[PDB]
Enzyme design. Structure first.
Site: not given
Ligand code: 065
Ligand code: CL
Ligand code: CL
Ligand code: NA
Lengths: 99, 99
Positions: A25-27
């Protein structure tokens, strides 16, 4: 490897003696794993995303094997819906985004 | 480009004639942007992130430039903390993860 993104980039990791699946997860700034025990000290932290914040335990200097590549770093443990490998460990295995 | 992950992979996007910053996010299935006006009809969608679910507005077939690459696809609008480019558009610009 070269991983395309037509589906979620899931890989097998080894952490704390346990094999798990996790999302590359690059995000994510940080690595966040579902509740499990890890050895050593920890401190509480709050991390935030879509939906708001969760409370996690921060463990430092944890070794993780990520698709066959060893790395060490901080791992956050708490009620994440998915195991996430964040940038703090992606850098250590030399992962890049290419287009 | 080959983007390393020591810093957040932020790029410039252009949507509705406006430049914005967004995060290239391989852990996102969907692209989610902060409140803005978009043309056409929208449909309801719920997305689940680290802190729980939120309601968003789903707009289909939206023209969006990402790091200088043209995409046309689905954009979700809602209270995301950062604009995120998810896999639905990362595939359109040819992005892969490599290590
Ligand atoms: C929202 C971004 C800025 C940060 N997130 C990482 C994401 O990659 C997250 C990773 C994620 C993936 C699945 C469930 C929860 C989180 N993906 C996500 O929210 O995606 C949403 C949009 O598309 C949908 O598909 C996936 C969920 C929806 S996170 O999970 O909130 C997160 C991860 C590590 C962290 C953090 C926040 O703060 C510091 O370290
Ligand atoms: Cl670290
Ligand atoms: Cl490097
Ligand atoms: Na430790």
């Amino acid at each position: 490897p070269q991983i395309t993104l037509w589906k979620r980039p899931l890989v097998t990791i080894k952490i704390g003696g346990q094999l798990k699946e996790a999302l590359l997860d690059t995000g994510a700034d940080n690595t966040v794993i579902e509740e499990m025990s890890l050895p050593g000290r920890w401190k509480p932290k709050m991390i935030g995303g879509i939906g708001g914040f969760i409370k996690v335990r921060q463990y430092d200097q944890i070794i993780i094997e990520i698709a066959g590549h060893k790395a060490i770093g901080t791992v956050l443990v708490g009620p994440t819906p998915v195991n996430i490998i964040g940038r703090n460990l992606l850098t250590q295995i030399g992962a890049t985004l290419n287009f």
